[PDB]
Amino acid sequence: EQTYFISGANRGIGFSVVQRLAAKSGVKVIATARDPASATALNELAKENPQVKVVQLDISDEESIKKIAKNVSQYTDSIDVFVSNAAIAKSFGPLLNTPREQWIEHFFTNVLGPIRLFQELYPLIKKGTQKKVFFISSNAGSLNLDFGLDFSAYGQSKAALNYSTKELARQLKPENFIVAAVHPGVVTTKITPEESAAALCKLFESLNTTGKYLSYDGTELPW
Amino acid sequence: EQTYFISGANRGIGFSVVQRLAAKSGVKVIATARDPASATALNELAKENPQVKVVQLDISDEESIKKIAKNVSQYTDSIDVFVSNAAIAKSFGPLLNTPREQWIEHFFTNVLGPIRLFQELYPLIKKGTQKKVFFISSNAGSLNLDFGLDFSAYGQSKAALNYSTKELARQLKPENFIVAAVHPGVVTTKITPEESAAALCKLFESLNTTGKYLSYDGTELPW
Ligand SMILES: NC(=O)C1=CN([C@@H]2O[C@H](COP(=O)(O)OP(=O)(O)OC[C@H]3O[C@@H](n4cnc5c(N)ncnc54)[C@H](OP(=O)(O)O)[C@@H]3O)[C@@H](O)[C@H]2O)C=CC1
Ligand SMILES: NC(=O)C1=CN([C@@H]2O[C@H](COP(=O)(O)OP(=O)(O)OC[C@H]3O[C@@H](n4cnc5c(N)ncnc54)[C@H](OP(=O)(O)O)[C@@H]3O)[C@@H](O)[C@H]2O)C=CC1
Numbered sequence A, B: 001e002q003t004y005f006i007s008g009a010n011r012g013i014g015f016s017v018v019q020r021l022a023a024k025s026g027v028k029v030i031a032t033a034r035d036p037a038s039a040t041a042l043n044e045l046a047k048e049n050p051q052v053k054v055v056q057l058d059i060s061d062e063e064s065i066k067k068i069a070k071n072v073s074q075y076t077d078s079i080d081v082f083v084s085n086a087a088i089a090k091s092f093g094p095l096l097n098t099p100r101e102q103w104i105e106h107f108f109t110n111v112l113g114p115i116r117l118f119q120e121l122y123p124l125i126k127k128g129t130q131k132k133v134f135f136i137s138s139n140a141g142s143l144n145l146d147f148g149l150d151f152s153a154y155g156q157s158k159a160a161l162n163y164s165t166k167e168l169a170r171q172l173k174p175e176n177f178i179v180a181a182v183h184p185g186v187v188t189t190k191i192t193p194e195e196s197a198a199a200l201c202k203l204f205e206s207l208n209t210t211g212k213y214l215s216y217d218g219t220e221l222p223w
Helices: A012-021 A040-048 A068-073 A100-126 A152-175 A193-206 B012-022 B040-048 B062-073 B100-126 B152-175 B193-206
Strands: A002-006 A027-033 A052-056 A081-084 A132-136 A178-183 A212-215 B002-006 B027-033 B052-056 B081-084 B132-136 B178-183 B212-215
Touching: A002 A012, A012 A027, A012 A040, A012 A193, A027 A040, A040 A052, A052 A068, A068 A100, A081 A100, A081 A193, A100 A132, A100 A152, A100 B100, A100 B152, A132 A152, A132 A193, A152 A178, A152 A212, A152 B152, A178 A193, B002 B012, B012 B027, B012 B040, B012 B193, B027 B040, B040 B052, B052 B062, B062 B100, B081 B100, B081 B193, B100 B132, B100 B152, B132 B152, B132 B193, B152 B178, B152 B212, B178 B193
Parallel strands: A002 A027, A002 A081, A027 A052, A081 A132, A132 A178, A178 A212, B002 B027, B002 B081, B027 B052, B081 B132, B132 B178, B178 B212
Antiparallel strands: none
C-alpha cells in the first residue's frame, strides 16, 4: 500500500488528483482543505471512498501548519508521495503597481507555506517507501521563460520556491528522495482539471530521478 | 551633475561605493544607514565631502521606507543612479535546518525592502537623466549555477529579487530605464570591498543596456 498526501484537495487540480487516486486500488490519500466542513465535493469523495482522509490545512497559517503532522499521524505512519498543491495566484503585472500586502501574501502562502508543510511532514515522508516530493510550481516561475506577461508576486513566489526545491533535491539525494517542481498546465492552451490530474498521477508514479523542473507532459523546464 | 543613491553605505561594499563616488567631481551621493549616529567612517566622509548626504533607512521597516522619498527630496530633485546595496546574509545550509524566522527576515529585508524602496524612489529616478537602477544581488541567486553550497533563505531572497528585477527591466524599457542585478564579487576568489566598489562604479557609469544579470567585472551571469 502507498500513502499519497495532497494540500488543497477541495477543488481545482487537487480535487481531480484525489478523485483519480481513489480509483487506484491500494491508495490511501491524505487530502486537505482549510475548511473541510465546507468542502462539499471532497467530503462526498471521502464518504464514498473512505481511503480518502480529509484533514484541515491553511498553508498561510503557521498554527494550522504546526498541527499538520499529528493530523496526518491520525491516519498514517508514513507518506510515499507528498504534493504541495494548495497555493494562491492573485497578483500579476507591474512591480510599481504591486502593493506590499501582495508581495507578503504570495511569500507566506506560496513559499514559506510549502517549506513549513514539507518540514513538518518530512519525518512521515522519510518512513515511507517512495520518498517522492512534488511541489506544484508554475512555468511562470522560471527565470529563463518569456510568456510576454509579468507575474508579479505570483511569479516571484513560484521562482523563490523553485530555488528552494532545487536545493532540497540536492540535500535529500543521499536519502534517496525524488524531489520535483511541476507545472500542472494552465487549467479551467488551457487544459481541464481532469487532464492535468491524469498527467500528474502518471508523472507522480513514473518519476525516478530528483532535482527536475517538469511540465505535466513530463518534459523538462529551465529553472 | 549626477545624483547617486546607495542603500547601506555605513560599511562594506556600500561604504566603498560612496567613498569611490565621493572622489569623482559632479557626483552628489545620498548614502543611507539604519543608524547614522554610529556610522563613524561615513559621517567623517560626509563631514569633509559635502556632496555626500547621509539619511536614515531601515529597508526591513515599512515606516522607514514610507519616509525615504520625502527625506531624499530635501537633498536632491532627482536620482540618476539607484543602487539597492543594503541587505542581509544570515541563513545558509540545509532547508530542514532553516527555521521559519530566517525565511521571513530574508524576504522582508532582501526582497520586499528593495522592491518597496524602488517604488518610493521611482519618481525621483524618473526625473533624473541616467535612469539607472541597480539591485546588488549574488551569483548565489542564479537558478542555473551550482556552487555545491546551500544558500537557504539568503539564496532564495536573491533569486526572488532577481525574478522581480528581470520583470522590472521589461516594464521600464519603454521609459528608457537601465535595470540590472549585479553580483559584487565575494568580499573580505575573494576581492576587497574597495576593489568591488572600483569595478561596480565602472559598471554603473558604462552599462547602457537594460535587463542584465552581471558580475562586478561586467561579464554576464545566467538567471
Ligand atoms: N491551473 C493553472 O492555471 C496553473 C496552476 N498552477 C499551480 O497549480 C496548483 C493548483 O492551482 P489551482 O487548482 O488552479 O487553484 P485554485 O484557484 O483552484 O485554488 C487553489 C487551491 O489551494 C487551496 N488554498 C488556497 N489558499 C490556501 C491556503 N491558505 N491554505 C490551504 N489551501 C489553500 C484552495 O482552496 P480554497 O478553496 O480554500 O481557496 C484550492 O484547493 C497551484 O500550485 C498553482 O500555482 C501552476 C501553473 C498554472
Ligand atoms: N559580501 C559578499 O561577498 C557578497 C555580498 N553580496 C551582496 O552585496 C551587498 C553588500 O554586501 P556587504 O557589503 O558584504 O554586506 P554587509 O553585511 O557588510 O553590509 C550590509 C549593509 O546593509 C545594511 N543593512 C542591513 N540590514 C539593513 C536594514 N534592515 N536596513 C538598512 N540597511 C541594512 C548594513 O547596515 P548595518 O551596519 O546597520 O547592519 C550594511 O550597511 C548585499 O546586498 C549582499 O547581499 C552578494 C554576494 C557576495
